[PDB]
Amino acid sequence: PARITLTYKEGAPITIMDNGNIDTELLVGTLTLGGYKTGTTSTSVNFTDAAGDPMYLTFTSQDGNNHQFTTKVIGKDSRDFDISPKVNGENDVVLATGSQDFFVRSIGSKGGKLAAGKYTDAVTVTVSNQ
Amino acid sequence: ADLTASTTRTATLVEPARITLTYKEGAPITIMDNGNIDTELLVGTLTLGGYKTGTTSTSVNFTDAAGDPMYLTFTSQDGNNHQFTTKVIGKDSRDFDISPKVNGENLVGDDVVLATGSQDFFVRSIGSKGGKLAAGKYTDAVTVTVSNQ
Amino acid sequence: SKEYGVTIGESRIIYPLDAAGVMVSVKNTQDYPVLIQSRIYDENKEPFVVTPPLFRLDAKQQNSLRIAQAGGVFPRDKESLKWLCVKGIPPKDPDKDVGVFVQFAINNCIKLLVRPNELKGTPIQFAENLSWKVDGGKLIAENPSPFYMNIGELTFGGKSIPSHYIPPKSTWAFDLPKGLAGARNVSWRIINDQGGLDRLYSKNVT
């Protein structure tokens, strides 16, 4: 019987700019989703977190001062066309056979100057029509 | 129907150490009637930037080859080794005099936190202890070392 | 105006003791080429190799330095502190006046913190454990942890004090500006391993 797996490969450390924000389109990490049924499409995949911001996964500082930044989740099909799974309910392509990489790409600070350090997000994926 | 998994991941954000320096030349220096140069002339204005707030005046050290503690030494280019000295001073937020280290020592004021964003320092003439400065081109090659907190 | 700038990609290096090496990026932010001269100094201001020790970095370009530990012996119950200094060397270049010509060069220096794997946790886990006394006209921080406590903000009686590190299992004495008589609250924040300012802690002096 089918079992969904979600693993992750951290990307490079992210540099905070002089103005306290981060650049866009940095590879923050790679999510690898596996175990879904043949034929599963991207609208059947929904990555969610606590912040629950539609379209974005939010990372939050561990220092109790609540700096955050947002990211988007985009993969690639074998034409190199973008695959946009739902993130907190909002984005349609067939996933690759067996498993699919999804790149977590930086957007920016949610507001204010970011303090260097570690930032976390606990992510859930729900895969429907299985 | 639905299947799920979850994971909690971490991103690492770093603050680099950026340092900049802008130097704005002062006016040319006139030799006076008795052959001395005037003291407290604005030789030039240094603006140090890029550093993180909390960076201190003792963490900044301007050095040169002459290595005279507290002074930068300018030397003629004509083979005669005419020299004069200058000091490097600025103002803190209360308008008190401060200085970075120059050749390893502070001429004036306590250790202070540098102004946020950037800090201006003034290179000001003192004099020559030799006397008798010739007209000419005088140089120094100055390293600014910032020891980041 | 003459302009100079050197950027190092981190503000400190956490060097795991006995690791083969770490990479750090350096960036020439200026419009002319420089020579990048990189040197390590001990904690006193004067085993680790930086490769390359000297190389040309063109305008606006970035390259990587490798910092490698080749042998050497370090204590295992505390961090050790060295300094990596990255200098940007720019290119070189009236019968009555004194014309003045000055060239600068920035030497950007960052802490190289040698950290035994034997230590558990990280500095932000222990930042609260600093304690404070006033003695011989100075404010004294005692750091019982095995980490350098790299203070980035310090306030005593509401007045800023220029920060400095507190060495592991030891102390540091800070000078007091005037008018601090009977002051009680010390608030501080350390700088974390990634260079960010950590959360604020407060206690009264003994």
Short mmCIF file of C-alpha atoms in Angstrom, two decimals:
data_model
loop_
_atom_site.label_atom_id
_atom_site.label_comp_id
_atom_site.label_asym_id
_atom_site.label_seq_id
_atom_site.Cartn_x
_atom_site.Cartn_y
_atom_site.Cartn_z
CA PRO A 1 0.00 0.00 0.00
CA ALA A 2 1.05 3.52 -0.93
CA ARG A 3 3.17 5.57 1.52
CA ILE A 4 4.04 9.31 0.93
CA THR A 5 7.59 10.29 1.79
CA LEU A 6 8.92 13.87 2.08
CA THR A 7 12.64 14.42 2.48
CA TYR A 8 14.76 17.54 2.12
CA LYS A 9 18.21 18.70 1.06
CA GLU A 10 19.25 22.03 2.62
CA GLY A 11 20.73 24.46 0.13
CA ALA A 12 23.48 27.04 0.67
CA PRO A 13 23.37 29.48 3.57
CA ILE A 14 21.41 32.62 2.67
CA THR A 15 23.18 35.94 2.80
CA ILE A 16 21.36 38.85 4.42
CA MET A 17 21.94 42.06 2.46
CA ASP A 18 22.96 45.43 3.91
CA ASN A 19 19.33 46.46 3.98
CA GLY A 20 18.34 43.43 6.06
CA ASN A 21 16.47 41.52 3.36
CA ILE A 22 17.42 38.57 1.23
CA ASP A 23 17.59 38.14 -2.47
CA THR A 24 14.80 36.45 -4.49
CA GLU A 25 15.02 33.04 -6.21
CA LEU A 26 17.76 31.62 -4.00
CA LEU A 27 17.56 27.80 -3.72
CA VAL A 28 16.74 27.53 0.00
CA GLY A 29 16.48 23.72 -0.27
CA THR A 30 15.02 20.90 -2.27
CA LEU A 31 11.92 18.94 -1.15
CA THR A 32 11.66 15.41 -2.60
CA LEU A 33 8.16 13.97 -2.60
CA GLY A 34 7.72 10.28 -3.25
CA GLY A 35 5.39 7.32 -3.11
CA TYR A 36 2.34 8.80 -4.88
CA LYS A 37 0.14 6.90 -7.39
CA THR A 38 0.98 6.83 -11.06
CA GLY A 39 -0.74 9.80 -12.69
CA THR A 40 -0.75 12.04 -9.65
CA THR A 41 -0.80 15.76 -10.60
CA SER A 42 0.41 18.90 -8.90
CA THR A 43 -3.05 20.13 -7.88
CA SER A 44 -3.33 16.95 -5.78
CA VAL A 45 -0.25 18.08 -3.72
CA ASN A 46 -0.67 20.63 -0.90
CA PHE A 47 2.34 21.71 1.20
CA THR A 48 1.18 23.46 4.41
CA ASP A 49 2.74 25.13 7.44
CA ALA A 50 1.74 27.00 10.65
CA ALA A 51 1.82 30.49 9.18
CA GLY A 52 -0.57 29.07 6.59
CA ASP A 53 0.04 31.87 4.01
CA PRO A 54 -1.48 30.79 0.64
CA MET A 55 1.30 30.20 -2.01
CA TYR A 56 4.19 30.55 0.44
CA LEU A 57 6.06 28.56 3.06
CA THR A 58 7.22 30.79 5.85
CA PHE A 59 10.47 30.43 7.81
CA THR A 60 10.73 31.92 11.25
CA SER A 61 13.68 32.83 13.46
CA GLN A 62 14.45 30.68 16.52
CA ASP A 63 15.48 33.66 18.69
CA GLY A 64 11.97 34.56 19.88
CA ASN A 65 11.94 37.94 18.00
CA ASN A 66 9.85 36.49 15.14
CA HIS A 67 11.78 37.48 12.01
CA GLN A 68 10.39 35.65 9.07
CA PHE A 69 10.79 35.22 5.40
CA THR A 70 8.74 33.61 2.67
CA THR A 71 9.56 31.08 -0.04
CA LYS A 72 7.70 29.47 -2.98
CA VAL A 73 7.68 25.84 -4.03
CA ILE A 74 8.29 25.05 -7.70
CA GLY A 75 9.42 21.94 -9.45
CA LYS A 76 10.20 21.11 -12.98
CA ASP A 77 8.80 18.62 -15.37
CA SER A 78 10.89 17.03 -18.05
CA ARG A 79 10.41 19.98 -20.50
CA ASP A 80 11.91 22.17 -17.79
CA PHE A 81 8.43 23.80 -17.35
CA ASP A 82 7.56 24.94 -13.81
CA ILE A 83 5.40 22.63 -11.67
CA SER A 84 3.48 24.59 -9.03
CA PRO A 85 1.96 22.37 -6.28
CA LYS A 86 -0.57 24.01 -3.91
CA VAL A 87 1.04 25.65 -0.89
CA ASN A 88 -1.46 26.29 1.88
CA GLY A 89 -4.27 25.59 -0.53
CA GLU A 90 -3.18 27.69 -3.64
CA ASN A 91 -0.79 27.07 -6.70
CA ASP A 92 -1.52 21.80 -13.30
CA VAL A 93 1.12 19.15 -14.28
CA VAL A 94 1.59 15.37 -13.97
CA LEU A 95 4.37 14.54 -11.48
CA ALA A 96 7.36 12.50 -12.54
CA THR A 97 7.14 8.69 -12.04
CA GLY A 98 8.02 7.57 -8.50
CA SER A 99 9.09 10.91 -6.99
CA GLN A 100 9.44 14.56 -7.77
CA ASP A 101 11.81 17.27 -6.60
CA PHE A 102 10.32 20.63 -5.58
CA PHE A 103 12.66 23.60 -5.18
CA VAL A 104 12.03 25.97 -2.25
CA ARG A 105 12.92 29.41 -3.61
CA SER A 106 13.34 32.61 -1.62
CA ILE A 107 10.97 35.45 -1.82
CA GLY A 108 11.88 37.90 0.91
CA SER A 109 11.56 39.12 4.39
CA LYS A 110 7.99 39.24 5.65
CA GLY A 111 8.96 42.67 6.96
CA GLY A 112 11.73 44.40 8.76
CA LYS A 113 15.43 43.56 8.85
CA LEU A 114 16.26 39.87 9.25
CA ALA A 115 18.73 38.82 11.99
CA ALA A 116 21.25 36.15 10.91
CA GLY A 117 20.76 32.78 12.58
CA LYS A 118 18.72 29.66 12.14
CA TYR A 119 15.13 29.78 10.88
CA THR A 120 12.63 26.89 10.89
CA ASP A 121 9.47 25.71 9.31
CA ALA A 122 7.63 22.50 9.95
CA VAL A 123 6.07 21.41 6.67
CA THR A 124 3.28 18.97 5.97
CA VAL A 125 2.34 17.61 2.54
CA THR A 126 -1.07 16.20 1.86
CA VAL A 127 -1.45 14.26 -1.38
CA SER A 128 -5.08 13.66 -2.45
CA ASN A 129 -6.68 11.41 -5.07
CA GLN A 130 -4.52 8.48 -4.00
CA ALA B 1 -7.91 9.41 -0.85
CA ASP B 2 -5.50 11.63 1.26
CA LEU B 3 -1.95 10.66 2.26
CA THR B 4 0.45 12.83 4.25
CA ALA B 5 3.90 13.28 5.60
CA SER B 6 5.71 15.99 7.35
CA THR B 7 9.13 17.25 8.14
CA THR B 8 10.72 20.18 9.92
CA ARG B 9 13.63 21.86 8.30
CA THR B 10 16.01 24.65 8.98
CA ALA B 11 17.49 27.45 6.88
CA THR B 12 20.67 29.27 7.85
CA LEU B 13 20.96 32.98 7.23
CA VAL B 14 24.32 34.68 7.59
CA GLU B 15 25.36 38.33 8.03
CA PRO B 16 28.61 38.94 6.07
CA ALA B 17 31.36 41.35 7.25
CA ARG B 18 31.16 44.30 4.81
CA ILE B 19 33.58 47.16 5.25
CA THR B 20 33.85 50.27 3.06
CA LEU B 21 35.92 53.42 3.22
CA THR B 22 35.42 56.66 1.33
CA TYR B 23 38.16 59.28 1.33
CA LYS B 24 37.37 62.81 0.39
CA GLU B 25 40.46 64.92 -0.17
CA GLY B 26 40.81 68.25 1.64
CA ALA B 27 42.20 71.49 0.29
CA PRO B 28 45.90 71.79 -0.72
CA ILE B 29 48.09 72.89 2.21
CA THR B 30 49.74 76.30 2.16
CA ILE B 31 53.23 76.84 3.62
CA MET B 32 53.14 79.97 5.71
CA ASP B 33 55.45 82.95 5.83
CA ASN B 34 57.82 81.42 8.42
CA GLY B 35 57.80 78.02 6.58
CA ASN B 36 55.38 76.11 8.93
CA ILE B 37 52.12 74.50 8.01
CA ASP B 38 49.07 75.32 9.95
CA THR B 39 47.81 72.93 12.51
CA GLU B 40 44.30 71.42 12.59
CA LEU B 41 43.89 71.65 8.81
CA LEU B 42 41.40 69.27 7.32
CA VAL B 43 43.65 67.08 5.31
CA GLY B 44 40.75 64.79 4.29
CA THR B 45 37.62 63.10 5.55
CA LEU B 46 37.32 59.34 5.90
CA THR B 47 33.98 57.68 6.03
CA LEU B 48 34.03 54.15 7.30
CA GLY B 49 30.93 52.09 6.58
CA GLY B 50 29.39 48.71 6.10
CA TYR B 51 30.08 47.58 9.62
CA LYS B 52 27.49 46.11 11.96
CA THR B 53 26.00 48.35 14.65
CA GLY B 54 27.93 47.79 17.91
CA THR B 55 31.30 47.96 16.11
CA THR B 56 33.66 50.05 18.31
CA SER B 57 36.31 52.75 17.85
CA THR B 58 38.94 50.53 19.42
CA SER B 59 38.27 47.84 16.82
CA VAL B 60 39.44 50.25 14.04
CA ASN B 61 43.19 50.70 13.48
CA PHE B 62 44.78 52.94 10.87
CA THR B 63 48.40 52.03 10.34
CA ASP B 64 51.28 53.10 8.20
CA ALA B 65 54.90 52.32 7.54
CA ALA B 66 56.29 54.93 9.91
CA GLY B 67 54.31 53.25 12.71
CA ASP B 68 54.32 56.33 15.00
CA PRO B 69 51.70 55.52 17.64
CA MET B 70 48.69 57.83 17.40
CA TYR B 71 49.83 59.56 14.19
CA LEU B 72 49.86 59.10 10.45
CA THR B 73 53.11 60.38 8.93
CA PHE B 74 53.33 62.01 5.47
CA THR B 75 56.78 62.01 3.77
CA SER B 76 58.09 64.04 0.78
CA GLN B 77 58.75 62.28 -2.47
CA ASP B 78 61.88 64.21 -3.26
CA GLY B 79 64.50 62.14 -1.43
CA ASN B 80 64.94 64.59 1.49
CA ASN B 81 62.54 62.81 3.91
CA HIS B 82 60.59 65.92 5.03
CA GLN B 83 57.75 64.70 7.24
CA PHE B 84 54.66 65.91 8.98
CA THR B 85 52.22 64.16 11.21
CA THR B 86 48.44 64.12 11.40
CA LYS B 87 45.90 62.66 13.75
CA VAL B 88 42.63 60.88 13.04
CA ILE B 89 39.65 62.12 15.05
CA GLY B 90 35.88 62.07 14.94
CA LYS B 91 32.86 63.00 17.05
CA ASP B 92 30.61 60.69 19.07
CA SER B 93 26.84 61.15 19.35
CA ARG B 94 27.27 63.56 22.26
CA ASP B 95 29.72 65.64 20.10
CA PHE B 96 32.77 64.57 22.15
CA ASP B 97 36.03 63.91 20.39
CA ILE B 98 36.89 60.31 19.69
CA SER B 99 39.57 58.58 17.69
CA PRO B 100 40.19 55.20 16.22
CA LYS B 101 43.50 53.56 16.99
CA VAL B 102 46.26 54.88 14.83
CA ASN B 103 49.25 52.64 14.76
CA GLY B 104 47.84 50.77 17.64
CA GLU B 105 46.92 53.64 20.05
CA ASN B 106 44.12 56.02 20.68
CA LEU B 107 45.04 59.71 20.82
CA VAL B 108 41.77 60.92 22.35
CA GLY B 109 38.62 59.90 24.14
CA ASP B 110 37.18 56.68 25.55
CA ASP B 111 36.23 53.61 23.52
CA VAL B 112 32.78 54.29 21.94
CA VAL B 113 30.33 52.56 19.66
CA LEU B 114 30.63 53.89 16.15
CA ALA B 115 27.70 55.78 14.67
CA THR B 116 25.09 53.51 13.01
CA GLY B 117 25.68 52.91 9.31
CA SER B 118 28.90 54.87 8.91
CA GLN B 119 31.31 57.10 10.86
CA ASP B 120 33.27 60.07 9.66
CA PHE B 121 36.82 60.59 10.71
CA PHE B 122 38.87 63.68 9.95
CA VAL B 123 42.60 63.62 9.17
CA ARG B 124 43.92 66.74 10.77
CA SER B 125 47.43 68.18 10.55
CA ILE B 126 49.55 68.52 13.66
CA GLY B 127 52.94 69.75 12.51
CA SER B 128 56.43 68.66 11.64
CA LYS B 129 58.76 68.09 14.60
CA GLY B 130 61.56 68.53 12.01
CA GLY B 131 60.41 72.00 10.93
CA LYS B 132 61.28 73.43 7.54
CA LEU B 133 58.80 71.52 5.24
CA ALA B 134 59.65 71.94 1.54
CA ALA B 135 57.05 72.44 -1.04
CA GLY B 136 56.21 69.20 -2.83
CA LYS B 137 54.21 66.02 -2.91
CA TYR B 138 53.84 64.19 0.36
CA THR B 139 52.40 60.69 0.62
CA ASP B 140 51.33 58.00 3.04
CA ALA B 141 49.91 54.52 2.42
CA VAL B 142 47.48 53.71 5.19
CA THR B 143 45.89 50.34 6.09
CA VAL B 144 42.55 50.52 7.89
CA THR B 145 42.05 47.31 9.90
CA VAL B 146 38.61 46.66 11.31
CA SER B 147 38.37 43.82 13.87
CA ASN B 148 34.71 42.79 13.58
CA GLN B 149 32.87 41.93 16.87
CA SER C 1 36.41 60.74 -3.57
CA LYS C 2 38.45 57.47 -3.47
CA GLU C 3 36.43 54.34 -2.60
CA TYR C 4 37.51 51.07 -1.03
CA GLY C 5 35.63 47.99 0.08
CA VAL C 6 36.14 44.37 0.95
CA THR C 7 33.34 41.97 1.89
CA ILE C 8 33.82 38.64 3.57
CA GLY C 9 30.82 36.27 3.21
CA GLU C 10 30.66 35.61 6.92
CA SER C 11 31.37 37.75 9.95
CA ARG C 12 32.94 34.82 11.90
CA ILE C 13 34.08 31.30 11.08
CA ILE C 14 33.14 28.45 13.28
CA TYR C 15 35.94 26.01 12.64
CA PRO C 16 35.17 22.48 13.90
CA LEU C 17 38.40 21.36 15.52
CA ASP C 18 40.23 18.79 13.38
CA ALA C 19 37.99 19.27 10.29
CA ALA C 20 39.93 19.37 7.07
CA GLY C 21 38.83 22.88 6.06
CA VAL C 22 36.10 25.41 5.54
CA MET C 23 35.49 27.83 2.61
CA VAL C 24 34.75 31.51 3.01
CA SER C 25 33.90 33.85 0.20
CA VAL C 26 35.53 37.25 -0.34
CA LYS C 27 34.14 39.93 -2.57
CA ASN C 28 35.85 42.89 -4.22
CA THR C 29 32.93 45.45 -4.17
CA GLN C 30 34.94 48.03 -6.03
CA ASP C 31 35.34 49.14 -9.65
CA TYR C 32 39.10 48.35 -9.85
CA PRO C 33 40.97 45.05 -9.44
CA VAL C 34 42.63 44.25 -6.11
CA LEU C 35 45.08 41.81 -4.62
CA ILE C 36 43.43 39.88 -1.80
CA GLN C 37 45.90 39.15 0.99
CA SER C 38 44.67 36.83 3.67
CA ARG C 39 46.40 36.15 6.98
CA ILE C 40 45.61 34.46 10.26
CA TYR C 41 46.69 35.89 13.63
CA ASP C 42 46.42 34.49 17.14
CA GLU C 43 44.11 36.03 19.81
CA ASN C 44 46.98 38.35 20.95
CA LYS C 45 46.79 40.32 17.60
CA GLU C 46 49.98 38.62 16.06
CA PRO C 47 48.60 25.54 12.05
CA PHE C 48 45.82 27.28 10.06
CA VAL C 49 46.51 27.96 6.40
CA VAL C 50 44.53 30.21 4.09
CA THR C 51 44.72 29.24 0.41
CA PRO C 52 45.46 31.21 -1.66
CA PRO C 53 47.43 33.61 0.59
CA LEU C 54 47.51 36.25 -2.15
CA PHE C 55 45.53 36.49 -5.41
CA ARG C 56 43.98 38.98 -7.78
CA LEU C 57 40.29 39.59 -7.57
CA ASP C 58 38.80 41.66 -10.37
CA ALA C 59 36.25 44.45 -9.95
CA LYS C 60 32.96 43.25 -8.57
CA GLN C 61 34.10 39.63 -8.41
CA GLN C 62 33.84 37.08 -5.70
CA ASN C 63 36.17 34.11 -4.98
CA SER C 64 36.52 31.51 -2.17
CA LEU C 65 39.39 31.10 0.31
CA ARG C 66 39.97 27.73 1.92
CA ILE C 67 40.94 27.77 5.65
CA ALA C 68 42.54 24.48 6.52
CA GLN C 69 43.82 23.13 9.78
CA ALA C 70 47.08 21.23 9.26
CA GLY C 71 47.94 19.58 12.65
CA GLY C 72 48.30 21.83 15.75
CA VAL C 73 46.95 21.16 19.24
CA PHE C 74 43.97 22.98 20.84
CA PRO C 75 42.24 22.59 24.17
CA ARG C 76 39.08 20.52 24.02
CA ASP C 77 37.15 21.96 26.94
CA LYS C 78 36.83 25.52 25.38
CA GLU C 79 36.85 27.37 22.08
CA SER C 80 40.03 29.04 20.83
CA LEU C 81 40.08 32.37 19.00
CA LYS C 82 42.10 33.34 16.00
CA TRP C 83 41.61 36.13 13.50
CA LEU C 84 41.37 35.95 9.72
CA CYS C 85 42.29 39.24 8.11
CA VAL C 86 41.45 39.89 4.49
CA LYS C 87 43.13 42.83 2.93
CA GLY C 88 42.24 44.43 -0.34
CA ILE C 89 45.35 45.85 -1.99
CA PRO C 90 44.37 48.37 -4.68
CA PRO C 91 46.52 49.23 -7.73
CA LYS C 92 49.26 51.96 -7.11
CA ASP C 93 48.84 55.57 -7.94
CA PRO C 94 53.54 72.89 -6.24
CA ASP C 95 56.82 74.86 -6.11
CA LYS C 96 54.98 76.67 -3.24
CA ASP C 97 52.32 74.21 -1.66
CA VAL C 98 52.32 70.85 0.16
CA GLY C 99 50.25 68.48 -2.03
CA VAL C 100 49.02 65.45 -0.13
CA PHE C 101 48.42 62.06 -1.68
CA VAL C 102 47.17 59.18 0.43
CA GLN C 103 46.21 55.64 -0.58
CA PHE C 104 44.29 53.34 1.63
CA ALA C 105 43.61 49.70 1.86
CA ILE C 106 40.98 47.89 3.94
CA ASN C 107 42.03 44.91 6.09
CA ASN C 108 38.73 43.31 7.10
CA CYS C 109 39.22 40.95 10.08
CA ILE C 110 36.89 38.33 11.46
CA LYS C 111 36.97 35.91 14.30
CA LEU C 112 38.01 32.34 13.60
CA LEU C 113 36.50 30.35 16.44
CA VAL C 114 38.01 26.91 16.84
CA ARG C 115 35.35 24.73 18.32
CA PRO C 116 35.93 21.26 19.68
CA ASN C 117 33.27 18.72 18.77
CA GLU C 118 33.42 17.83 22.43
CA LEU C 119 31.51 20.99 23.39
CA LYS C 120 27.77 20.54 23.63
CA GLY C 121 25.38 23.09 22.22
CA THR C 122 26.07 26.56 20.97
CA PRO C 123 26.66 30.00 22.51
CA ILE C 124 23.07 31.11 22.29
CA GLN C 125 22.19 28.18 24.63
CA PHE C 126 24.36 29.74 27.38
CA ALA C 127 24.13 33.49 26.74
CA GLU C 128 21.90 33.95 29.79
CA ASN C 129 24.50 32.45 32.15
CA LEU C 130 26.79 35.55 32.09
CA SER C 131 27.07 37.16 35.52
CA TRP C 132 28.20 40.68 36.37
CA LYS C 133 30.03 42.50 39.24
CA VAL C 134 31.50 45.98 39.53
CA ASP C 135 35.04 45.94 40.92
CA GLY C 136 38.20 48.33 40.72
CA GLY C 137 36.08 51.00 38.82
CA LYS C 138 35.07 48.45 35.99
CA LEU C 139 32.12 46.29 35.02
CA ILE C 140 33.12 42.60 35.00
CA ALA C 141 31.41 39.83 33.02
CA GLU C 142 32.07 36.27 34.06
CA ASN C 143 31.41 33.60 31.39
CA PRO C 144 31.19 30.10 32.86
CA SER C 145 30.53 28.58 29.44
CA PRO C 146 33.15 26.99 27.10
CA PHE C 147 32.26 29.41 24.30
CA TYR C 148 33.47 32.88 23.49
CA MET C 149 30.57 35.16 24.45
CA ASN C 150 30.78 37.56 21.59
CA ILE C 151 28.86 40.49 23.05
CA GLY C 152 27.25 42.66 20.43
CA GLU C 153 25.22 44.99 22.58
CA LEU C 154 25.83 45.93 26.22
CA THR C 155 23.98 48.51 28.32
CA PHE C 156 24.67 49.33 31.94
CA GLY C 157 22.34 51.62 33.84
CA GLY C 158 20.83 52.58 30.51
CA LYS C 159 24.21 53.64 29.06
CA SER C 160 25.84 51.86 26.08
CA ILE C 161 29.17 50.16 26.76
CA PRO C 162 31.47 49.33 23.76
CA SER C 163 31.22 45.54 23.52
CA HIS C 164 33.96 42.95 23.46
CA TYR C 165 34.07 39.22 23.75
CA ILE C 166 34.03 37.42 27.04
CA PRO C 167 36.48 34.48 26.82
CA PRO C 168 35.37 31.05 27.86
CA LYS C 169 35.51 30.10 31.49
CA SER C 170 36.93 33.48 32.25
CA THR C 171 36.05 37.18 32.50
CA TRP C 172 36.31 40.48 30.85
CA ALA C 173 36.54 43.93 32.44
CA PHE C 174 34.74 46.85 30.77
CA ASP C 175 35.52 50.53 31.40
CA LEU C 176 32.66 52.69 32.86
CA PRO C 177 31.83 56.18 31.46
CA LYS C 178 31.02 58.87 34.03
CA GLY C 179 27.77 59.10 36.02
CA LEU C 180 27.05 55.35 36.40
CA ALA C 181 27.06 55.63 40.28
CA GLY C 182 24.62 53.12 41.85
CA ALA C 183 23.66 51.53 38.43
CA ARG C 184 22.11 48.04 38.74
CA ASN C 185 20.70 46.50 35.49
CA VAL C 186 23.05 45.03 32.86
CA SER C 187 21.36 44.13 29.49
CA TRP C 188 23.32 42.35 26.76
CA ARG C 189 22.96 40.48 23.57
CA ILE C 190 25.48 38.13 22.04
CA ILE C 191 26.27 37.66 18.40
CA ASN C 192 25.30 34.17 17.23
CA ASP C 193 27.36 31.80 15.08
CA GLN C 194 25.86 33.24 11.86
CA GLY C 195 26.62 36.85 12.90
CA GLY C 196 23.16 37.92 14.05
CA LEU C 197 22.27 39.71 17.20
CA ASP C 198 20.63 37.33 19.66
CA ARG C 199 17.91 38.06 22.13
CA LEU C 200 18.24 40.45 25.05
CA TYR C 201 19.13 39.33 28.58
CA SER C 202 19.03 41.37 31.73
CA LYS C 203 20.21 40.94 35.34
CA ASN C 204 21.42 43.17 38.15
CA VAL C 205 25.13 43.33 39.06
CA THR C 206 26.19 41.78 42.36
#
